[PDB]
Amino acid sequence: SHYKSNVRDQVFNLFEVFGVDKVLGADKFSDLDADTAREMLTEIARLAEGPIAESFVEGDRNPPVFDPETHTVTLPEGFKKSMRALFDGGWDKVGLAEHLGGIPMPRALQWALIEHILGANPAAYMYAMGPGMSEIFYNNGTDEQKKWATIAAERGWGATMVLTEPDAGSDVGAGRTKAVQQPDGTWHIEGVKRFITSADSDDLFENIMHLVLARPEGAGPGTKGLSLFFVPKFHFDHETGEIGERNGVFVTNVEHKMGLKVSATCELSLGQHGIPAVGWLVGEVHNGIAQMFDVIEQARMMVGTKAIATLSTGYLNALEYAKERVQGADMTQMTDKTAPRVTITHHPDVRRSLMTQKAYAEGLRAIYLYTATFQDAEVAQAVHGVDGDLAARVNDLLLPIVKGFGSETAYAKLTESLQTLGGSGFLQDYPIEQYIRDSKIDSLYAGTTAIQAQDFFFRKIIRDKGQALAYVAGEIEQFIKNNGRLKTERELLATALADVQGMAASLTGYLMAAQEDAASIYKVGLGSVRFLMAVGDLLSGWLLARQAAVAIEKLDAGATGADKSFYEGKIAAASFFAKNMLPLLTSTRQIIENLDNDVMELDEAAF
Amino acid sequence: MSHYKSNVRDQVFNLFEVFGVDKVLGADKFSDLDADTAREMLTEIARLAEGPIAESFVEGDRNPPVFDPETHTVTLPEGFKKSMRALFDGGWDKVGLAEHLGGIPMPRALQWALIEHILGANPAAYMYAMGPGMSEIFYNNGTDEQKKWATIAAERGWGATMVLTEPDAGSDVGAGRTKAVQQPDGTWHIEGVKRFITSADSDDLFENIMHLVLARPEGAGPGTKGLSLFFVPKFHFDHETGEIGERNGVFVTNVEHKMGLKVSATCELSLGQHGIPAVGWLVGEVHNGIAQMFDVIEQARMMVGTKAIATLSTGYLNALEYAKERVQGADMTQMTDKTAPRVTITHHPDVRRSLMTQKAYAEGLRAIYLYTATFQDAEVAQAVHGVDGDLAARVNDLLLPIVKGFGSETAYAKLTESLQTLGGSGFLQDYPIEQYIRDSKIDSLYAGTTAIQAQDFFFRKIIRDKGQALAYVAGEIEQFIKNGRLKTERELLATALADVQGMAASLTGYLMAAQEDAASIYKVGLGSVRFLMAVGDLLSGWLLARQAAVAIEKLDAGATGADKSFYEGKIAAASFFAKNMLPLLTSTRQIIENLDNDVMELDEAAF
Ligand SMILES: CCCCCCCCCCCCCCCC(=O)SCCNC(=O)CCNC(=O)[C@H](O)C(C)(C)COP(=O)(O)OP(=O)(O)OC[C@H]1O[C@@H](n2cnc3c(N)ncnc32)[C@H](O)[C@@H]1OP(=O)(O)O
Ligand SMILES: CCCCCCCCCCCCCCCC(=O)SCCNC(=O)CCNC(=O)[C@H](O)C(C)(C)COP(=O)(O)OP(=O)(O)OC[C@H]1O[C@@H](n2cnc3c(N)ncnc32)[C@H](O)[C@@H]1OP(=O)(O)O
Ligand SMILES: Cc1cc2nc3c(=O)[nH]c(=O)nc-3n(C[C@H](O)[C@H](O)[C@H](O)COP(=O)(O)OP(=O)(O)OC[C@H]3O[C@@H](n4cnc5c(N)ncnc54)[C@H](O)[C@@H]3O)c2cc1C
Ligand SMILES: Cc1cc2nc3c(=O)[nH]c(=O)nc-3n(C[C@H](O)[C@H](O)[C@H](O)COP(=O)(O)OP(=O)(O)OC[C@H]3O[C@@H](n4cnc5c(N)ncnc54)[C@H](O)[C@@H]3O)c2cc1C
């Protein structure tokens, strides 16, 4: 039972902070009320803590085994039993479109439900993303393809996203897998893809939809020349869904990884074994990179939310350990060798550690749920008063924060969780070292942190003309401008907001200097990740302070018992974060204001 | 070649061109070891480390030790035992051993540079080889009779352990309850269970193991002052001839399953619980256990810090070699051109940022442990610093928790950049970086957690010392700042020195004000680790800048070729470190000056 959930904080964000319940029972969510949403969260949290978390250790210690002659993978039995628990509850259809068998709901509620699976056994959610992919295929498909997507969703087929090649990882546009058009309008896909998650999955599903980027013969170069293809593991009857002949797409290797071991990560060979890999052009148009980014956006949201879910259960494990571990005397009695021994939560450095973990875990939860409130036009209208166009641009702005800042932060603060256990934290008997291993990948797949920071600056700020950024900054400034019990926190936030504004101005400055001296663009690259992390810190501190303001109101109204303790912890967290994390942004702004190209001019031989 | 990439060039640069250790080679204690021989020794052990020692790095992780409950022994993988035999056959387990025990006299600074290579290539191999060094400590603390046993133990190459920790006594060594009962013949029977004992069994590597066990004589007082230290051998032996006799009652009962460092058997150790007494001999025949054991702990803390630093160094050189060859993307100056030539990733600004961060910290940390070691011999300290024996010992004691605490935390943090440089391939066991990360996570925990390092540094190495060692080091930094091409670095170092000075003053004020307000002491606890880390960053910046001043002198004298590249890299690293790492200490000073007890007052239930 490694997984420790936090429904209370989820509901606090969804209802008391963001007001997502304002849309429940109205319009698209007419048949889902606030009580039902709360019961779903409790239900999936309990299932996550039980049957899903049950095989978390098994999947790591008894990982999938590859048979290279059948080109298939065997998963451990306990993990497949967790997968069936997921399917039997319908949790592979959270927020799926109603016409595909789904229950309509705000994306903020959907991601909070998913948080529990990602905290308990994140590879289980990844294997279960087939219906979500069926829905993207549906939205992008022809009328006839929409009929296959409906079948795939109803039969619960698995799915993969197939981009990476050995020479084309960050540079997707360099891929050489090719597509050869047939007279009847299908295509034959030829190439080897690498690092494909779930490319085989034992007997979990009756079929797998591979969504494959490939370059049609004679198409131009880069990502703009790529097309997206529906390549099923098995041919099937397009009218009934009955499974047919094996299609020419075969796993030829399974990687040995640091963590996330139960997710089979596969070399995938298309058309290499003398059987054609038939693919159907998605939507029967050539628009591959744009179509595939519908998938990439969801994957990046998932990876950020995965890292955040894992830091949260890492923190709650550390806290429960610390509450019970007796070691040493209180610091006020450190010289008295007969003083009473105390539990380690009495020690300042452990409280520092735990509050650092708490504030980042909770601030990150607020960030991904805040981000999700812009993913439905109706939620964004009802809770923020912003129209659909700006909501989409704000969601797109925040996705690289959820992914890049979420993955980096969670991994770094799990170091504090492990440390809280002392030497025991190094044992596989406790789950934190596996949290660390399982979460290292989140800075890498779905685009590395450097790729997230480059997306954030060039596409989500500059190409956006700063409109989404200016929107969020205006909300932060409005909080600062508005009791004086948060006076010191608002002053710290004001300094941090000006620090980030100063970073944006410097980086924009280097970009405009590149009109005259091309090399000046390198300074944007030097400072981009630090800027992305600074915006994440500023958002964490703002959202914690918002949570603190709500908590003050609820305490003033007369909260008691466990509610009172919860609200007290929000005040302490927002105050701790403002005073210990935000001021570092000032030094980071001055560092960014002084970047230079010395490190770019250095001979490679001098490293 | 192997996973292990060594850096003898940087070691020799530090030892000779920066600290002038070659000035003592050939004279007095080191009469028979000249500079040429020292360099050939470093080259020889580097090749041993890259060859047979590194050969079983992966194997000890993938095929880890197995506990046998039928015999209460541990079995080690055959390839790792072959590596151990290569270490012994070359005499490398007698590096810096006293001449009368069979060693080769050498400066401690040379000794630790030699040991760095084993710690980089397979650090558990050095840990299993620490027997002869423990015999020397037993010799130094022993009676005349006991010195004869310690001589035999060195000559026969017996293994050794340091046996302190119990389930309820880890950081708080003084809570130990293992008991010592004196026998009529003047031996003792030791009774208790110890936990997490490194090398507590080692298969058939040795013919005997010396366990150095802390235990509380019946009737003694509480805390660490009531502990005594006992020589408890695995087998009884003839005190004159060394011939091995009957088994003594000290048995391993389990082996821990760990995140990393798997080939180091970490064992529960039972004394007197299996039907025969564990006979022990009181060391020095005096009751002075925690003082005696700290002779061992001091060495273990130097070892752990040097291990973490060795591991970052080979992590960096692996990532750098990968980056030079990995082609991905276009030059940022050609971002918008999708037919622009592809480049190797060292052309990308974020990768150069990541590599220079790894390089500056790895080399700064190497400078710190070598500098620390130049204070471990009175003669070296006199010859290269002009300091007498008493001040030397105090400065070495000041620097040890920096080597250990700042070393372990920094190495694990910056290996994250090493892994990131490989992209998705960094997450594969095919490359050594993910094992580096798992193997080095323990360095912040054993030999005293980081918080214990930070408390030792401030309470014992500064306050109890009345700032003598600290003022000495600060005066050497100020002298460098005092002194054109290094004007900016010296200005940034002056800011960092004043920041650390401000931190020390604030924390000393919180401590002294505890006399009138007891809870004031908690702010010392809240800030101690950040203070320790700030001193390590300041030392790193200063030593790198000193290196850059030597590099400038050598370039002015006409260095060419590979020498010139090396020197250019030192100037670049010192400058990058001063401009990108040092300024953050200003925000950390201001954070420390505003610490408060809110987080101490918060109800535990609010977390
Ligand atoms: C809910 C269910 C989801 C279904 C899931 C089913 C199976 C999967 C389950 C398992 C999960 C596994 C998680 C790990 C997965 C992976 O790693 S998949 C591989 C991920 N690969 C990447 O993320 C690529 C990283 N590299 C880049 O992003 C790089 O910056 C790119 C490739 C974009 C650079 O290429 P360029 O050619 O230089 O890009 P350019 O800027 O000019 O844009 C071209 C074109 O791309 C579109 N685009 C680009 N960026 C975005 C963003 N951020 N969002 C949307 N669209 C984007 C645009 O079409 C753009 O053209 P324009 O004319 O509009 O500019
Ligand atoms: C090269 C040869 C080496 C041989 C090695 C052989 C075996 C091979 C394998 C070993 C490698 C594996 C590495 C991992 C091994 C381990 O983890 S062993 C377990 C390590 N345990 C610790 O480090 C303890 C951590 N806790 C503390 O340090 C804690 O702060 C202590 C225990 C010090 C607090 O106890 P107190 O009683 O409160 O301490 P106090 O401050 O009052 O001092 C009491 C007494 O202790 C001595 N002392 C304390 N601190 C030091 C230091 N830094 N240096 C020397 N001596 C110290 C003093 O005697 C002191 O008395 P005073 O009157 O002088 O104050
Ligand atoms: C467990 C796992 C599962 C995966 N699953 C899938 C999957 O299901 N589907 C799929 O299509 N792919 C998948 N991948 C591939 C994954 O997305 C890539 O590994 C990732 O995009 C990084 O690419 P790469 O490994 O080639 O690294 P590289 O692109 O070679 O990057 C190496 C280094 O160079 C840096 N770099 C590269 N280009 C630039 C640039 N222009 N500017 C600055 N820095 C740059 C990177 O940040 C990194 O630090 C998976 C990978 C892993 C590890
Ligand atoms: C791989 C491994 C090998 C080991 N080898 C040996 C060996 O050979 N010999 C041996 O004797 N021991 C050995 N140990 C034990 C090791 O030194 C201890 O784990 C370590 O000292 C921490 O003690 P603990 O595990 O009981 O943690 P705890 O002392 O319970 O610490 C728990 C947490 O509380 C914090 N904390 C505790 N006390 C205080 C305080 N007073 N103030 C502030 N914070 C505090 C710690 O920093 C940590 O975050 C080994 C351990 C491991 C993991």
PDB file of N, CA, C and O in Angstrom, chain B residues 67-74 163 190 192-195 197 199-201 209 211 213 232-236 246-255 267-279:
ATOM      1  N   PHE B  67      22.466 -13.533   0.441  1.00  0.00           N
ATOM      2  CA  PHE B  67      22.631 -14.016   1.805  1.00  0.00           C
ATOM      3  C   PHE B  67      22.257 -15.489   1.862  1.00  0.00           C
ATOM      4  O   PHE B  67      21.235 -15.891   1.309  1.00  0.00           O
ATOM      5  N   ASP B  68      23.064 -16.287   2.564  1.00  0.00           N
ATOM      6  CA  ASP B  68      22.796 -17.719   2.733  1.00  0.00           C
ATOM      7  C   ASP B  68      22.436 -17.973   4.197  1.00  0.00           C
ATOM      8  O   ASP B  68      23.324 -17.944   5.066  1.00  0.00           O
ATOM      9  N   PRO B  69      21.150 -18.145   4.535  1.00  0.00           N
ATOM     10  CA  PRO B  69      20.789 -18.452   5.930  1.00  0.00           C
ATOM     11  C   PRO B  69      21.283 -19.835   6.416  1.00  0.00           C
ATOM     12  O   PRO B  69      21.237 -20.102   7.618  1.00  0.00           O
ATOM     13  N   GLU B  70      21.710 -20.729   5.528  1.00  0.00           N
ATOM     14  CA  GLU B  70      22.215 -22.026   5.967  1.00  0.00           C
ATOM     15  C   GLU B  70      23.582 -21.910   6.614  1.00  0.00           C
ATOM     16  O   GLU B  70      23.984 -22.804   7.362  1.00  0.00           O
ATOM     17  N   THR B  71      24.337 -20.871   6.278  1.00  0.00           N
ATOM     18  CA  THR B  71      25.687 -20.671   6.797  1.00  0.00           C
ATOM     19  C   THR B  71      25.892 -19.294   7.397  1.00  0.00           C
ATOM     20  O   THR B  71      26.982 -19.038   7.927  1.00  0.00           O
ATOM     21  N   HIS B  72      24.910 -18.389   7.314  1.00  0.00           N
ATOM     22  CA  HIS B  72      25.093 -17.018   7.813  1.00  0.00           C
ATOM     23  C   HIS B  72      26.329 -16.379   7.159  1.00  0.00           C
ATOM     24  O   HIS B  72      27.218 -15.817   7.807  1.00  0.00           O
ATOM     25  N   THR B  73      26.365 -16.459   5.845  1.00  0.00           N
ATOM     26  CA  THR B  73      27.410 -15.843   5.025  1.00  0.00           C
ATOM     27  C   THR B  73      26.756 -15.173   3.811  1.00  0.00           C
ATOM     28  O   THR B  73      25.573 -15.346   3.549  1.00  0.00           O
ATOM     29  N   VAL B  74      27.539 -14.379   3.087  1.00  0.00           N
ATOM     30  CA  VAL B  74      27.113 -13.705   1.867  1.00  0.00           C
ATOM     31  C   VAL B  74      28.004 -14.204   0.746  1.00  0.00           C
ATOM     32  O   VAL B  74      29.202 -14.396   0.963  1.00  0.00           O
ATOM     33  N   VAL B 163      31.091  -0.749  13.286  1.00  0.00           N
ATOM     34  CA  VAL B 163      29.823  -1.291  13.747  1.00  0.00           C
ATOM     35  C   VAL B 163      29.262  -0.368  14.828  1.00  0.00           C
ATOM     36  O   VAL B 163      29.584  -0.513  16.020  1.00  0.00           O
ATOM     37  N   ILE B 190      29.965  -9.418  23.926  1.00  0.00           N
ATOM     38  CA  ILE B 190      29.194  -8.342  23.330  1.00  0.00           C
ATOM     39  C   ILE B 190      27.829  -8.901  22.945  1.00  0.00           C
ATOM     40  O   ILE B 190      27.746  -9.970  22.341  1.00  0.00           O
ATOM     41  N   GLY B 192      24.088  -7.867  21.258  1.00  0.00           N
ATOM     42  CA  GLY B 192      23.206  -6.906  20.631  1.00  0.00           C
ATOM     43  C   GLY B 192      23.042  -7.194  19.150  1.00  0.00           C
ATOM     44  O   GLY B 192      23.632  -8.128  18.586  1.00  0.00           O
ATOM     45  N   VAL B 193      22.190  -6.385  18.543  1.00  0.00           N
ATOM     46  CA  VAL B 193      21.911  -6.456  17.103  1.00  0.00           C
ATOM     47  C   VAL B 193      22.257  -5.103  16.491  1.00  0.00           C
ATOM     48  O   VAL B 193      21.741  -4.075  16.926  1.00  0.00           O
ATOM     49  N   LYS B 194      23.111  -5.110  15.479  1.00  0.00           N
ATOM     50  CA  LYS B 194      23.484  -3.915  14.751  1.00  0.00           C
ATOM     51  C   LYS B 194      22.909  -3.994  13.341  1.00  0.00           C
ATOM     52  O   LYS B 194      22.631  -5.083  12.833  1.00  0.00           O
ATOM     53  N   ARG B 195      22.709  -2.833  12.714  1.00  0.00           N
ATOM     54  CA  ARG B 195      21.960  -2.749  11.454  1.00  0.00           C
ATOM     55  C   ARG B 195      22.772  -1.928  10.462  1.00  0.00           C
ATOM     56  O   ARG B 195      23.497  -1.009  10.853  1.00  0.00           O
ATOM     57  N   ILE B 197      25.397  -2.735   8.422  1.00  0.00           N
ATOM     58  CA  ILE B 197      26.852  -2.847   8.543  1.00  0.00           C
ATOM     59  C   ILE B 197      27.428  -3.225   7.175  1.00  0.00           C
ATOM     60  O   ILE B 197      27.164  -4.315   6.643  1.00  0.00           O
ATOM     61  N   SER B 199      30.015  -4.439   4.508  1.00  0.00           N
ATOM     62  CA  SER B 199      31.014  -5.517   4.445  1.00  0.00           C
ATOM     63  C   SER B 199      30.949  -6.472   5.634  1.00  0.00           C
ATOM     64  O   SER B 199      31.940  -7.123   5.951  1.00  0.00           O
ATOM     65  N   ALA B 200      29.781  -6.630   6.265  1.00  0.00           N
ATOM     66  CA  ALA B 200      29.743  -7.427   7.495  1.00  0.00           C
ATOM     67  C   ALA B 200      30.038  -8.896   7.226  1.00  0.00           C
ATOM     68  O   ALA B 200      30.521  -9.614   8.113  1.00  0.00           O
ATOM     69  N   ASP B 201      29.749  -9.361   6.019  1.00  0.00           N
ATOM     70  CA  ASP B 201      30.384 -10.554   5.485  1.00  0.00           C
ATOM     71  C   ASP B 201      30.826 -10.245   4.069  1.00  0.00           C
ATOM     72  O   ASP B 201      30.254  -9.384   3.402  1.00  0.00           O
ATOM     73  N   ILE B 209      37.755 -11.165   9.452  1.00  0.00           N
ATOM     74  CA  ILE B 209      37.219  -9.806   9.428  1.00  0.00           C
ATOM     75  C   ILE B 209      37.330  -9.240  10.837  1.00  0.00           C
ATOM     76  O   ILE B 209      36.923  -9.894  11.805  1.00  0.00           O
ATOM     77  N   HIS B 211      35.733  -6.717  13.202  1.00  0.00           N
ATOM     78  CA  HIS B 211      34.605  -5.846  13.477  1.00  0.00           C
ATOM     79  C   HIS B 211      35.013  -4.896  14.610  1.00  0.00           C
ATOM     80  O   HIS B 211      35.369  -5.346  15.706  1.00  0.00           O
ATOM     81  N   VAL B 213      33.421  -2.575  17.116  1.00  0.00           N
ATOM     82  CA  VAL B 213      32.046  -2.506  17.589  1.00  0.00           C
ATOM     83  C   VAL B 213      31.935  -1.541  18.750  1.00  0.00           C
ATOM     84  O   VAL B 213      32.643  -1.689  19.758  1.00  0.00           O
ATOM     85  N   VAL B 232      36.292  -7.169  17.747  1.00  0.00           N
ATOM     86  CA  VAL B 232      35.499  -8.394  17.686  1.00  0.00           C
ATOM     87  C   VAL B 232      35.788  -9.081  16.354  1.00  0.00           C
ATOM     88  O   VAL B 232      35.236  -8.706  15.321  1.00  0.00           O
ATOM     89  N   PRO B 233      36.671 -10.077  16.328  1.00  0.00           N
ATOM     90  CA  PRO B 233      37.024 -10.710  15.056  1.00  0.00           C
ATOM     91  C   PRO B 233      35.990 -11.762  14.688  1.00  0.00           C
ATOM     92  O   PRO B 233      35.357 -12.355  15.557  1.00  0.00           O
ATOM     93  N   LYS B 234      35.824 -11.972  13.381  1.00  0.00           N
ATOM     94  CA  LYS B 234      34.926 -13.019  12.905  1.00  0.00           C
ATOM     95  C   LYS B 234      35.377 -14.391  13.387  1.00  0.00           C
ATOM     96  O   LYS B 234      34.552 -15.208  13.807  1.00  0.00           O
ATOM     97  N   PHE B 235      36.679 -14.673  13.306  1.00  0.00           N
ATOM     98  CA  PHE B 235      37.270 -15.904  13.825  1.00  0.00           C
ATOM     99  C   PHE B 235      38.255 -15.563  14.939  1.00  0.00           C
ATOM    100  O   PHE B 235      39.059 -14.624  14.793  1.00  0.00           O
ATOM    101  N   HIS B 236      38.232 -16.346  16.031  1.00  0.00           N
ATOM    102  CA  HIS B 236      39.352 -16.282  16.967  1.00  0.00           C
ATOM    103  C   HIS B 236      40.653 -16.614  16.234  1.00  0.00           C
ATOM    104  O   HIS B 236      40.655 -17.253  15.181  1.00  0.00           O
ATOM    105  N   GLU B 246      38.712 -20.827  16.074  1.00  0.00           N
ATOM    106  CA  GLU B 246      37.286 -21.100  16.094  1.00  0.00           C
ATOM    107  C   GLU B 246      36.472 -19.871  15.724  1.00  0.00           C
ATOM    108  O   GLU B 246      36.876 -18.730  15.957  1.00  0.00           O
ATOM    109  N   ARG B 247      35.286 -20.123  15.196  1.00  0.00           N
ATOM    110  CA  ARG B 247      34.360 -19.050  14.873  1.00  0.00           C
ATOM    111  C   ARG B 247      33.951 -18.328  16.151  1.00  0.00           C
ATOM    112  O   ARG B 247      33.710 -18.947  17.182  1.00  0.00           O
ATOM    113  N   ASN B 248      33.919 -17.012  16.094  1.00  0.00           N
ATOM    114  CA  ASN B 248      33.447 -16.136  17.157  1.00  0.00           C
ATOM    115  C   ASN B 248      31.977 -15.808  16.886  1.00  0.00           C
ATOM    116  O   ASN B 248      31.522 -15.865  15.738  1.00  0.00           O
ATOM    117  N   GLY B 249      31.229 -15.465  17.943  1.00  0.00           N
ATOM    118  CA  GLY B 249      29.759 -15.408  17.849  1.00  0.00           C
ATOM    119  C   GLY B 249      29.154 -14.134  17.280  1.00  0.00           C
ATOM    120  O   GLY B 249      28.242 -13.521  17.866  1.00  0.00           O
ATOM    121  N   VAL B 250      29.609 -13.753  16.089  1.00  0.00           N
ATOM    122  CA  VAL B 250      29.187 -12.511  15.434  1.00  0.00           C
ATOM    123  C   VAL B 250      28.776 -12.889  14.002  1.00  0.00           C
ATOM    124  O   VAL B 250      29.626 -13.292  13.193  1.00  0.00           O
ATOM    125  N   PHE B 251      27.465 -12.848  13.713  1.00  0.00           N
ATOM    126  CA  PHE B 251      26.918 -13.463  12.503  1.00  0.00           C
ATOM    127  C   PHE B 251      26.015 -12.486  11.766  1.00  0.00           C
ATOM    128  O   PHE B 251      25.181 -11.821  12.380  1.00  0.00           O
ATOM    129  N   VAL B 252      26.168 -12.432  10.438  1.00  0.00           N
ATOM    130  CA  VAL B 252      25.221 -11.695   9.613  1.00  0.00           C
ATOM    131  C   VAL B 252      23.898 -12.461   9.565  1.00  0.00           C
ATOM    132  O   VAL B 252      23.893 -13.684   9.466  1.00  0.00           O
ATOM    133  N   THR B 253      22.767 -11.740   9.647  1.00  0.00           N
ATOM    134  CA  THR B 253      21.439 -12.365   9.614  1.00  0.00           C
ATOM    135  C   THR B 253      20.560 -11.942   8.439  1.00  0.00           C
ATOM    136  O   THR B 253      19.456 -12.481   8.291  1.00  0.00           O
ATOM    137  N   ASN B 254      21.001 -11.003   7.605  1.00  0.00           N
ATOM    138  CA  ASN B 254      20.207 -10.504   6.475  1.00  0.00           C
ATOM    139  C   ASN B 254      21.139  -9.693   5.602  1.00  0.00           C
ATOM    140  O   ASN B 254      22.153  -9.188   6.084  1.00  0.00           O
ATOM    141  N   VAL B 255      20.744  -9.477   4.350  1.00  0.00           N
ATOM    142  CA  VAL B 255      21.423  -8.489   3.511  1.00  0.00           C
ATOM    143  C   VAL B 255      20.364  -7.566   2.930  1.00  0.00           C
ATOM    144  O   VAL B 255      19.321  -8.038   2.455  1.00  0.00           O
ATOM    145  N   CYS B 267      24.495  -5.311   6.053  1.00  0.00           N
ATOM    146  CA  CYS B 267      24.010  -6.505   6.748  1.00  0.00           C
ATOM    147  C   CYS B 267      23.547  -6.190   8.152  1.00  0.00           C
ATOM    148  O   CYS B 267      24.179  -5.407   8.869  1.00  0.00           O
ATOM    149  N   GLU B 268      22.473  -6.837   8.559  1.00  0.00           N
ATOM    150  CA  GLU B 268      22.210  -6.899   9.986  1.00  0.00           C
ATOM    151  C   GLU B 268      23.245  -7.818  10.632  1.00  0.00           C
ATOM    152  O   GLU B 268      23.623  -8.857  10.072  1.00  0.00           O
ATOM    153  N   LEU B 269      23.786  -7.392  11.779  1.00  0.00           N
ATOM    154  CA  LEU B 269      24.908  -8.106  12.387  1.00  0.00           C
ATOM    155  C   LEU B 269      24.537  -8.455  13.827  1.00  0.00           C
ATOM    156  O   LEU B 269      24.359  -7.548  14.638  1.00  0.00           O
ATOM    157  N   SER B 270      24.409  -9.749  14.144  1.00  0.00           N
ATOM    158  CA  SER B 270      24.007 -10.177  15.486  1.00  0.00           C
ATOM    159  C   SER B 270      25.218 -10.587  16.296  1.00  0.00           C
ATOM    160  O   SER B 270      26.027 -11.396  15.834  1.00  0.00           O
ATOM    161  N   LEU B 271      25.302 -10.075  17.520  1.00  0.00           N
ATOM    162  CA  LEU B 271      26.429 -10.357  18.405  1.00  0.00           C
ATOM    163  C   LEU B 271      25.905 -11.158  19.593  1.00  0.00           C
ATOM    164  O   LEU B 271      25.062 -10.663  20.352  1.00  0.00           O
ATOM    165  N   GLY B 272      26.378 -12.400  19.721  1.00  0.00           N
ATOM    166  CA  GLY B 272      26.030 -13.217  20.861  1.00  0.00           C
ATOM    167  C   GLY B 272      24.599 -13.708  20.858  1.00  0.00           C
ATOM    168  O   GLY B 272      24.035 -13.938  21.924  1.00  0.00           O
ATOM    169  N   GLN B 273      23.987 -13.866  19.692  1.00  0.00           N
ATOM    170  CA  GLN B 273      22.572 -14.239  19.612  1.00  0.00           C
ATOM    171  C   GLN B 273      22.362 -15.645  19.067  1.00  0.00           C
ATOM    172  O   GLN B 273      21.217 -16.087  18.991  1.00  0.00           O
ATOM    173  N   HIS B 274      23.427 -16.351  18.669  1.00  0.00           N
ATOM    174  CA  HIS B 274      23.322 -17.623  17.963  1.00  0.00           C
ATOM    175  C   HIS B 274      23.963 -18.770  18.728  1.00  0.00           C
ATOM    176  O   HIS B 274      24.296 -19.798  18.130  1.00  0.00           O
ATOM    177  N   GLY B 275      24.114 -18.633  20.038  1.00  0.00           N
ATOM    178  CA  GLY B 275      24.557 -19.739  20.849  1.00  0.00           C
ATOM    179  C   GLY B 275      26.026 -19.722  21.238  1.00  0.00           C
ATOM    180  O   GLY B 275      26.439 -20.575  22.021  1.00  0.00           O
ATOM    181  N   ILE B 276      26.840 -18.834  20.670  1.00  0.00           N
ATOM    182  CA  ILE B 276      28.207 -18.707  21.157  1.00  0.00           C
ATOM    183  C   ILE B 276      28.470 -17.236  21.412  1.00  0.00           C
ATOM    184  O   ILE B 276      27.879 -16.369  20.748  1.00  0.00           O
ATOM    185  N   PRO B 277      29.311 -16.908  22.381  1.00  0.00           N
ATOM    186  CA  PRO B 277      29.529 -15.499  22.690  1.00  0.00           C
ATOM    187  C   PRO B 277      30.343 -14.820  21.592  1.00  0.00           C
ATOM    188  O   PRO B 277      31.180 -15.433  20.920  1.00  0.00           O
ATOM    189  N   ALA B 278      30.039 -13.546  21.383  1.00  0.00           N
ATOM    190  CA  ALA B 278      30.896 -12.675  20.594  1.00  0.00           C
ATOM    191  C   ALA B 278      31.954 -12.095  21.533  1.00  0.00           C
ATOM    192  O   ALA B 278      31.685 -11.165  22.293  1.00  0.00           O
ATOM    193  N   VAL B 279      33.163 -12.638  21.473  1.00  0.00           N
ATOM    194  CA  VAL B 279      34.227 -12.178  22.367  1.00  0.00           C
ATOM    195  C   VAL B 279      34.868 -10.924  21.778  1.00  0.00           C
ATOM    196  O   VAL B 279      35.191 -10.870  20.578  1.00  0.00           O
TER     197      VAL B 279
END
